[model samples]
Target chain A: ALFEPYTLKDVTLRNRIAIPPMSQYMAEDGMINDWHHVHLAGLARGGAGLLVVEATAVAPEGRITPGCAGIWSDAHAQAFVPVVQAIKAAGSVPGIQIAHAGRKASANRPWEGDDHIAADDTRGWETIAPSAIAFGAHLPKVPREMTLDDIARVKQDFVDAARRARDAGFEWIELHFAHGYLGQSFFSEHSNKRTDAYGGSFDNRSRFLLETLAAVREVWPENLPLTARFGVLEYDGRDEQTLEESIELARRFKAGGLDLLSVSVGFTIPDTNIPWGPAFMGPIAERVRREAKLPVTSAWGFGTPQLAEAALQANQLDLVSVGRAHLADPHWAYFAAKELGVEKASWTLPAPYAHWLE
Target chain B: ALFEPYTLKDVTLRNRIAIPPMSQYMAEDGMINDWHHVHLAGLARGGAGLLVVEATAVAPEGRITPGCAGIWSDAHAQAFVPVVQAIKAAGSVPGIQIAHAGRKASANRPWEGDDHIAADDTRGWETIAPSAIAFGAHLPKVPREMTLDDIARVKQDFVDAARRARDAGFEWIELHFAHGYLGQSFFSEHSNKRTDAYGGSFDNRSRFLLETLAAVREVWPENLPLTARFGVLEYDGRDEQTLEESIELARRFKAGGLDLLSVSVGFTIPDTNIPWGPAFMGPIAERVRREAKLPVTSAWGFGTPQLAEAALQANQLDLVSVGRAHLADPHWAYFAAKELGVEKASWTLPAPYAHWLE
Candidate 1:
């Protein structure tokens, strides 16, 4: 079941394995280089059905760190042309997640402190969010509250970024509405202290996310997949309430023309225990897929082939996002194919490797 | 034991694991592009200590197939600049094997029939060797017998290629004297019928190889490790005599300033039966290294962690070459590290992957 093909809209994946979006933090000035080119192309050739690139900032100031990739300009988007072409050439669907980091912006790279940049740091920038709350831990920077003008401008950034991704030949577009970013912050009362129409009630907080998706849908091709990754549950001792609200928002996203939902936790705050374990997100993602009637993928620790296969066979996950396993072995798809007893499993790879493997 | 570093001349490997040169057969017009770039870079990042590139032709007609990589010209050598740099950046010593395919030239790709190009095929080219004899079986192309001038010209091509490789910043160089190529054809009685100074007796048959290495040594850095691969036995009816002659030639290579020898069986003719098994070359490589008093590495199913560790621990192989296993998992080095109980084995990878894998 894990090795089976999947189709969403006009896009057909070779298998149900997807390399979920993970940032390398190797880009510079919003432009990707040889690092990303090889990293992405290598993954595609590793035999994944769909490869979603790391979260790319829709605007310059929206970047999580200085090294974060961005598609803010035509030149920045142009840099992705060859990478996208290489990915497709290697028999994988190219996907990109356009994002605004919101209150999570201006932080150091994960290995480099992983906290908010110091006040004297020249690399840091003023971040914008729905409210003025700080994530308050390693990330303790309070962002400026977004005005109505700021909200409209950020939405246009998404539209522009989507247009560039489409122009660059990406077949799948994912809006980065998860991970305690702008969209997630607005949806959570813990972060959103705004007294305006964009905050407070369930409907009011969902307006920003719905508007962003609707705006991107106008430009992204209907034939290609339009998806969003959302934190369906915070796992912050409010699992029931948070999941209920997140599912409601997921339905609104579906009605707004979203094709799939990548379910993950609300990295909304650093104080919450995530209960990370192998296939921990399977049950929560299954609930979201069942309640929202949307195809879903979730990644916490689904690296083991057996766990991934079990989730697929049980119909809990439409696609399993195996993260670090790919880093440990880019050919993890072939491993899973072999482990699942797929006939001619080595053929999951390209002729160069497949011919030798079999 | 496998994680211990090895040093030859001024080049030091992080571990005694080497990714032997393997062709992708994906080049066009003897030039490498993104395919080679990503393949090489990904392997380097997979934590191999030494990454020797695929066999590259020294001249156009010397190529095994049209798709074989070449360093015959400045433009062809220029294609490897970024790949070498990327490998070095990933902490793996970059190396290349300069080769002349001899009797095996002009064959189809390993998968696309893997035989002599059909007589009517436009892609076929005339091949040159020590004698005008066909290899027999699927590779039945009778090569043109080379004259003394042709031998000298081919030797000069090796010299020019060494200069180009040094200019392109390769840290280590290996002459492709193995794999039934021109050098192997000269050494084997089955292929060589020449009565000239380049063939017939043991010394005469080794002259062409020795002179080529001497010429390349003039340009390649003396501080860097210089190496060559050689087939030490035919595995036919004359195993004892063949091994004796091959070891004599290996002794001559060391006296000629060679740093290492990569040992394997002579594929000079197609009629021989080779007993292929896991670490099958370990005993043979041990004999050659012990008798010749030279460092040796050999491939032929040393992919298992225990097998590789056993070879290194027993001092049979200075470095273990793991081939197709790398194709199955580019990070096979990390797997071996973990299996062999290296502390923080995940650190064998880069920070992006190490942070997650550990």
Candidate 2:
């Protein structure tokens, strides 16, 4: 079952091994270089059925770090052409997660303290959120309260970034609506304090996410899978209310042309205590898939063969997104194949490595 | 002449382009992984004549960061075999810089603020140097003073590391004696305040370096080009005296069977003003070559094609060691060839890339 193929629209994955979006923090001024080129190409050759690039900024101020990749400009989008070609040549679907970091923008790289950039730091920029409030603690900078015009401009940036991704030859598109970014902030009561159409009511909270999806869908080809990553619950003791509201949002996402949903936990505020354990998000993901009647995927500790297989067999998730495990071994899919007793596991890698391993 | 072949001892570089050692901060427990493998292989395929790997630690405590590579153990050395083979397979000579970071050990990566690891950080380790002084400013940790026994053990470690490098199929070897590291610290009066045989006088300061070179020569193959990188001047108001002393050491290095010398500036202290500019090291490199009567190469400000060509044609350097330029563009040599109007610039790349570029 772990080695089974999955189809979405016109794309058919060779196996269930999907390399989820993970940031490298190696880009230069939103432009990717060889570090990204080789990193992506090597992973594709490692037999991942699908490889989604890290959360790429839709605009300059949306970047999580100075080193984060961006696709706001046609030039930045064009930089991905060879990388996309390399992934396709290796028989893996090249996907990208277009994002706006919102209040979490202009922060340091995870290894560089993972805090908000200091005010005096030249790299720091003014971040925008649904409200003017700060994320607090490590992220102490107060973001600007976004105006309606600002919201419209950002939505257009998403559409432009998606069009560029298509021009660069990407086949799968994932809207980064999760992990306390702009979309999730709009959906979360903890961050979104607006009195306008984008705030308060459930419909208002989901308006930003749905509208962005509709805008992107206009330019993004229908033959390609259109997916989104969203936090289903905050685990901030508001799980019952959050889950109910999030499940409703997932239903609307499916109705609004989103082919797949990537379920995740909320990082919207620092006050939440997340129960971080292996395969911890599985049961929660299962609830959303069942209630919302949507094809779902989730990340956070599904690298183990038994866990990934068990999750799939138990109908917990349609796809298990693996992250950091791939960093330890780019050929992790081959490793998973071998551990699962698949035939000719060595063939999961490219010929150069596969022949030698065999 | 930029594309002309040069013979150093029994090894022949296909062209004059050399990629000097630069740290990646990607290793885990001193062991090389796919990161190192793909990085070196990618650069090799980019048409560099010689790809000198980053400063690889000779012992566990010699690491600059927890992420720095080490060749202290058979296991660590064995990990490099595939990477060395990969570089050679791409038609580039494989070389490694055997290093001991000295007082600079156990610091964060360059991008991680380049400071000493905090005491509470589990990743931090006790560092050692010729004396107990700190590098100062951003690097504020005072290292432990080494005993004579410690010095002897470190020398033996270098010899063992060289033997392991040779066994792992490396064709060229470099002793990392520059950049205010252990070897350079011993040679610089600013760092070595020891009142023993290893300190005080010029021959005493040069003793550790000269003896280590002689010992490493016993194990390293005579057929291979044995090289060293050394600081010629501190540029700290002592240029004339420092240059004379450094030139004397270079002559001794040449007399002691060192085939090539990679000349560099002293980063011994923060007080020095290194007039940073394009091709700034050319005249200095020419002076060292003439005074020491040795083949020379220098890194800073030589990434430009015009400067590289001018330095080579003027006989300032036998080889121009380009560092950060390669980081910006892995195919820098091909770019340089193209910019310099070489007829078959695309052919400088591997056939796989060359065919497409042509």
Candidate 3:
């Protein structure tokens, strides 16, 4: 297996390895604090070729949670400068993904068991979706169905968030279309039961995501790569979504100017059945790549260097995303490279921590 | 000042103290994990009359960070049942904030410096917003400005997310309008600079939020209290917002069926000018309450018991929101009651940890 630099447009990754997007919910507002610098810089030093931030809300309202990262203001940009500098300075290619939860707006934190905040409570907010329908049973509030005007405003929000990411000094960007989020909801029948032009049929269902992508592609610099993350299946019911449907969705995204696909399977929906373990959902990525015939990355325990290298060698995926793996070992990438006989380094930790690591 | 129970609609708080919405960013795929249970349960045990989960994304994309809580599916609701049970068992009111960050989707977590994620990065997603313009300087990922269809879907998403929250066993709900989010953006021209019907004039910009609120209110049981969080001021010109504008926004929200106001100042855009000290930005809640003429809950640093009591006693706010303070000390409310010389025995900690404090 060859571990060489991979170039997307004018930017190049030192290797095929990438540190997947992970969330460290530490911001008060949308600004990045010292936590970001240390975490991302550590990953960069860990020898991951590309360091990606988690899904950041482009608008305050679009934020999945109140504490999410934001690019809706100048301070957001300024707040991000140091983190971007740190990641780049550490020799990793830095990138970001802009997203809106759409119908998936309000709820509790994961640690809290994904509960709904009460009206008298502080955490909950009025949520929104493609149609007036609620996502699943027992949700706090049903969302207001968006109007044509709203669709227009949201599209612009994506464009603005992308521009902010660029200003924050990120070189690569991805539009979040995966999960059972706004984009995927509009793309899946199980989530999007809308009657308007933005839902129902495949084309109509995909219009919201596709249009948003086109709008984002317009503002995103051509020299930089733009991509989309997609949920390929509903999981529990294999009959719910065919690989063809997922492929078709990816093709439409590609047509809208997406350069890559971060493929995942299943959603956070009620009936979504997932097989959790090592190499979870890797096969889905491979299938999506075969259909879409585009660059793809597989997440969920696909972070091991040997596995990632094997996937790349076998054409299972173009990249592997590691979430908990990084948390378990921030320097997993560097250690993996050394273990795989790919790279040589004296210190996996920072110079200050080198003595301690040894 | 008396520390009496405040009643909103049909729900009664043991006291005027509240746990404000704060994201813990510890979820995976919108499901609550152990971290959430510990954090929120601790707050409930800590003695706050009402414990609101942080702004959980109504939808997965609505999540501010990839790890924020969500209410998009039944699993999400199922995941929350135990949490609600725990809070109620602890004798505290539980709530969730449903939200759509709108344009603020997709970016690094706050701990990662709030930058956008690239396609290959694990956490990056394409963001959507109300306009194509970036939030501010340096944060340059032009957002995918929403269309009418997009807005309609978002409204529906909110309603659906609320429904899910209700199903998940919540009695109170809040719409996140503060901090330059989707609702706030529509309410303020600072971050929302659009010529569309959803933007431009106050009425137009207010249209999206108002209609969305109405939709949520329609679905949210009337018996349950509904609240809106609003940024009372722009702090500086960074967000292009104002106090007067926020007041008007609050009034409109009330007309749209908002039952309460979670008042705060400043957008999330980070700036050196933001004073991160004890009880900073507390006065904005007072002003919003006075001007907006609505029941207001003060966010910001009212995290301590003394500050919470002062805000409530002075009539600066009807509710004092405690976030990180509660996280740091789950018994904060108990301590606060001790400081205020209020009924302390009723708000004691769980039996297991009671001995430690003693």
Candidate 4:
């Protein structure tokens, strides 16, 4: 009935209804802001058993946007104390995603159009990645390819970031490996076009990600749940990878100590042949769950309470992530509960909102 | 005194100003929606000499969000015809940014806060990337890490996407390499943690990106300008690279036949630390311009008209990219021209908005 207080290692998620991680891109110059506070805290109050904070960069240079939250330093940790407190105060398990966007670092905010911003323009800067190549076009500010030393430093930064997140009182910790960012880039062939210990073969390409995971895991509390988001496909072209290949990659990630896999598909090439509609990702999630045998979550284009409940009931997914739908109507969960004729208070209603009724 | 018509390869820009690539994250099942038409067409009317449509995913799986515009098929191309027609009709050169978000594909819109939408929920689908990694906590779906074949397909998709953009009547094109997306992932050690022909070594890492660029170039109009967005750096980290590294990358891109460089910095991780509230990115832009000796555009942290003019006049940058600032005021350029006392009505309005003048 309680999802038996789901536990990983030693930490416990009060319920199975976890509010999946989400980023507000609210950090200004990498500092946490009130947006972070309200977003996370509000979700916590919505009755999620666990509330994973959005991805926070481990270093200033690792941010996916100039405004992303970070846990790169003691100061960063200190800045986020209020956020942790707010979420915890709402009785929800709080977590943070530590990340290094790698080559994907340094771009415009989503509202600003999610592309590379020029350094001379406002909110732009120089970025780094695994190779010296630019992301798409041959931009003048091409990123410097990483060296062995660079790799070592990034791993250490992750560890440091973990420590900071811990100090900030996060109960669950996640490593960002999805969305063409650091960890997943190393794992995806569509992006990790390299030929080194970090690139040529599966072992090579997985080196940096696995090593970082292991490193971060070492510092991360064993009691805390450690997880990653993995990209499983680079769909397109006659020669594109098959779903089987993606499953194998997911298997490897599981072997690398990934406790959970958020089964997402596709890359940002903007021209892959995928079915863009509701429940399109269900097959992918089912496959990863079957192959990886790990707890998983899925999102994007996912809408409605009936569909989410059906996915869970069908065992297609362990968690259902909602975004725009929730923004449009925060009481989605509550409405669903009512629709389902459940007796418990709706998950969507905040305690304050519920309290006034009594 | 006129920063007149600029020609690149075979295409010519009426002026130095470019609308730059901006994503609306507003699409209906991969079809460009009215929101896109109004938003992008408005930019064309705003006096931008070149208007590059935001990243249009080549495939459905390549989409970064459910709302991402698509060009994976003839239907997609047809769907986007209106956008291109509008931009061209508005007097600004029309362009498109073809991209594969890599590991960052298939997720929720920014307004709902970027997260993974469950496959059973709405239009969410299985996303693919360089690896099976998540961008942040359990936000979006975990992307399927791409395989070698996947890489090829993604590249081919770009080529095909280019063709579609051209067929849709676009003269300029760009490959998204900046931001935490697909192309940029391979370029960064932080993201491309792989160690395959696509991973560890610089050449290997550059392989996918370069080949994709070449592939696009081959099909993309030779007379048209093909630009890239690079992630330059100005931070201190073990994995962090320098301006010189970015310069060298630019050189390589030039050798590969890239027409221009859209320079930017940072987003390696979700919470990267960056100095906010100032034009600190100016130096980084100057450095890239000096070293690459290439026509460059810079974005990030530049908001005021005086600063934009200064950057252009000082020869520090060739163009200025404004995001939210532009959104807040679509006539930012007009206001800027007025502020600078350059009140030329010819450069003022598009036919649609021209009625105001009458």
Candidate 5:
């Protein structure tokens, strides 16, 4: 079942293995180099069906770190064309997650201490969110409360970014409305404190995500898969309420033309303890899939062959999004095939390796 | 002239530009993974004439860190085959430097403070050297002096590594005899305190390097270039005498069928202050080339276009080895051609990028 092909909209995956978006923090001045080109191309050649690039900022101020990739300008979009072509050349679908980090913007890379940039640092910039609140703890900067005009400008940036991504030849476009980023911040009650149309009630909180999706859909092709990665639960002792609201939002998203939902947990605050274990999110993702009646995917674990296979058989997810496993071994799909006792497992890899491995 | 072709025995370089070995510290348990495969392949595709892999330990105990790549086993050697093929497919000669870190073994990666492993570290192993001395300062591990059997075993390891590299389809092989490692320690008077036949005078000091080169030459194809990276001077107030002896050894190495000499400074002692600047090694490389009548290549600052060109026109170096600059920009060869006013600068890159840039 893990090796079975899946079709969504007009695109068909060769297999179920999906390489989820994982930031490399190797970019320079918002532009990716050979590091990204080879990294993605090599993974595509490793037999992954869908290779989603890292979360890329739609604007400079949206960047999570100084090293995050961006699609703010035509030049930045052009920089990704070769990489996108390379992925397609290897028989893999190239996807991108357009993002805005919100209050989480201007933080150092995870390996470089993983905190907000110090006030004296020249690289630090003012961040914005639905409210003037700080994520607190390691991220202590209070973001400026975005005005109505600011919201409109950011929405247009998403539209521009979506247009550039389409022109860059990305077939799968994901709106990064998860991990407590801008879109997720607007959707979460803890982060969104505004009394305007963008905050307060569940309808108001979901307004930003729904509106952005509609705006991006205008530029994005109808044939392609338009997806959204949303945090479905906070687990901050208010899990039942948060889960209900998130599930309700998922149903609205499906109605608003979102082809898929990448379900995830909220990183809205660092105080909550996430139950970190293998396949921990499978049941939660299954609930969302059932409640929302939408195609779904989830990441936080399911890298093991048996675990991913189990999740698929249990109807938890349509696609198992694997992240760190790909970093450990890009040819993880081939490993999965071998582990699952598939016939001609080596065929999952490109000829150069397949011939040798066989 | 910078763009001119170079022929070393049977292998012909597309240009004088060479990507010298640079350690990535990404390998695990002495095995190369997707990180190395992508990193090397990307550099090859970026248009370097020769892509020399990082220092690969000939044995487990010879590795600088647990993360260093190795060729101590058949499995380890097999890991490099696909990477070699990828480099050749991109029209670049694949080369590897077989190494033994000696006293410098069992240290943390540069980013991890670049110090010897702590005593409590389970990963730490006993390091070997010509004498029971510590490098001091950041490197304070006192190495065990090698016995006659230990020396013979290490020598055989080099021969085995060379044979495996040949089978793995490496076009060129380099003995890492520089940077205060095993071979350099045997040469320097400060490190080699032995009174036996393997030490004492110049002939004894040159024995290990000379014997290892001869043994590797037997298995490594004569048609392919046989190279060695040698530290020419200690620069610790022993300048003139060390330079003369180093040049004489270079003459003998050339006599022993060494195809090219990669001249470098002696890192034997920590007390010396190297006058670090751009093209600082040019004059020293020039002296060795003139005195020994041997072709030489030196790294420490030939990355800039005009400097590399001037060094080539002046016959200071046959090949210009560039390191960190390539890390900053893999398309440095393309950047160089543009700066040097080549007819079609974009052509330096492969068709994928060239078509776009052109």
Candidate 6:
């Protein structure tokens, strides 16, 4: 099943393997240079069916760090033209995730400090979230509460980013709503305490996410896959309640024409006894896909081929997202193919490698 | 021994692992595009201390196939500027092998037919070698014998290519004199049956290779390492004689200011019986290094981590040139580090990958 081709809408993947967006944080002032071009192109040639680029901020200040990529203007989007072309030329669908870091914004790079920048740091900027609540711990920056105008402008930024992605020749677009980012925080009560239409009740909390999806749909091509990464559970004490509410949002997203859901956990507060293990998110993602009746994918410790194949065979995931294993070996898909006894597995790569390896 | 840093002249390698030049056979009119750029940059980032590019022709007719990369002109060399910078930025020394294919020139791509192009094919051109001899079997084209002027012009081409490589910012350069190419044919008795100063005797057969090395050394910076890949022996029945003579030539090259030698077998003819196995070239490379008292590296099945480490520990190889395994996994160097029990093995890669993998 891992090697079997999968089709969603007008996009047909050669296999069920998908390389989810993993941040490189190597961009400069919202512009991607040779670093991103070489990195993305090599992964595309590594034999993955879908190669989603790293999260790109919709606005400059929305970036999580100074190194995060952004697509706020025409020039920023233009930089991805060759990258998108290179991915398609290598027989993989190119995708991009438009993101807003919310309260998690203005943090240092992972290897640097991985915490909120100092108050006096000249590189730090003012961040905005749904409410003025701080995500305590290392990221303790309390963002300024958003006004109605701020919400409208942020939604427009998503629409513009989607349009630019289309112009840049990306075949798929994913909204970065998971991992305790802007949209995930709005849905969770811990980070969102706004008493307005954009917060408070469940429906009000979901208003921003559904509205952004609908606005992006206006510009995104219907033939392409429209997806989003959403945290279905917090793994906190309220697992039962959070899962129920998150599934309901998933159903609403389907109603709003969302094509696929990349099921994940809410990294919202970060203080949780999460039962982390191999394929830990498999069952939860399966529940969401089953209840919401949508195509789904999930990451976190699914690097093993047998685990990915078992999950796919059990109908738990429509696509398996392999993350760090790809960092360890960009040809992880080929590795998975060989492990699962795919015939002529060496041929899973490009001609230059296939002939040599076989 | 495997992860130990190696220093020769002014250049220092972080480890003994070297990614040898492997042909991609994917270029257009002697210019490298995104294909070469991505392929090279990814390997450099994979943690190899040295990344030598594929056999790039010093002249148009020197190319093995229409898709082979070339450095015969200024524009062709200019195409490598970004690639060289990317490799160095990833902390690997950038090197290139400038070659002339001789009788092996003008064959179709390996997967296409792995043979000579049809007589009527426009892709086929008149090949030039030391003598009008055919490298039988798959490659049956008898090349035109080179005149004295032709030899001088080809040597000048090698000098000009070395200069361009230097100007393109490559810190190291390898003169292609192996793999049944132009220089290899000029040396071996099976291919070279000439009656002039270019062939027939040991001194005559060694003339072209030594002269090319001297010419390239004139332009290539003395501070940077100058290397060459030489076939030390033909695995035919005359191995004893061939190995002895090849060792003598290695001594001559060392005396002529060569920094290092990449040892391998002479594939001058298809009838030779090669004893292929895991680390098959280790003993041969060791013999050459000991006999000639020069630093050396060899490729031909050193992909296994234990085999690589054993060879390095036993003082058989100065550097392990891993080829096909790198195609199987660009991060083969990191995998070797972990297998060899290097501390913080994941840190062999760049920061974006190291923290995640660790």
Q: Which candidate should be chosen as best, given lDDT against the real structure?
A: 6
Could you tell me the lDDT of residue B58 within candidate 3? 69
Off by over 4 Å in 5: A1-255, A258-358
How close to the true structure is residue B190 of candidate 4, measured as C-alpha lDDT? 67
DockQ values of all predictions: 0.84, 0.03, 0.01, 0.01, 0.05, 0.90
Q: What is the TM-score of each candidate against the true structure?
A: 0.98, 0.56, 0.49, 0.48, 0.57, 0.99
**CA-based DockQ, model 3:** 0.01
lDDT tens digits by residue: candidate 3, A170-276? 99998888776677777777767778899889889879988888888888898998987877777667634556787887888777777788887647476655778
How many collisions between residues are there in candidate 3? 196
Residue by residue across A1-358, what tens digits does model 1's lDDT show?
A: 8888999999999999999999989999999998899899999998899999999999999999999999999999999999999999999999998898999999899989888999999999999998888999888888999999999999999999999999999999889888999888988888988888998899898889998898899999999999999988787888899999899999999988999999988888877888878898999999999999999998867878889889998989999998888988999999988887889989999888999888
Using TM-score as the measure, which candidate wins?
A: 6
Candidate 6 residue runs with Cα over 4 Å from true position: none
Binned by DockQ into CAPRI classes (incorrect, acceptable, medium, high), candidate 2 is incorrect
CA lDDT, candidate 2, residue B191:
96
Error of 5 at A334 (Å): 32
Question: Best candidate per DockQ, number?
Answer: 6
Which portions of model 2 miss their true places by more than 4 Å? B1-358
Name the better of 2 and 6 by DockQ: 6
lDDT of 5 by residue, A1-358 (tens): 8899989999999988899888878788889986688878877877889999999999999999998999999999999999899889789999999999999999998767789999999988999999999999999999999999999999999999999999999999999999999999998888999999999999999999999999999999999999989999988999999999999999999998999999998798877978989989999999999999999999866778999999999999999998866654567788799889999888797543454355
Sort the predicted structures by TM-score, highest score first: 6, 1, 5, 2, 3, 4
Every candidate's fraction of true contacts kept comes to 0.82, 0.05, 0.00, 0.00, 0.09, 0.89
Q: Which ten residues in a row have the lowest lDDT in candidate 5 chain A?
A: A349-358
lDDT of the candidates, in the order given: 0.92, 0.89, 0.71, 0.69, 0.90, 0.93
Interface C-alpha RMSD per candidate, 1 decimal: 0.8, 17.1, 15.4, 18.0, 15.6, 0.6
TM-score: model 2 vs. ground truth: 0.56
Model 1, B156-249: lDDT tens per residue? 9999999999999999999999879998999899999999898789889888999998999999999999999999998899999999999999
Clashing pairs in 1: none
Off by over 4 Å in 1: none
Residue by residue across A39-78, what tens digits does model 6's lDDT show?
Answer: 8898998999999999999999889999999999999999
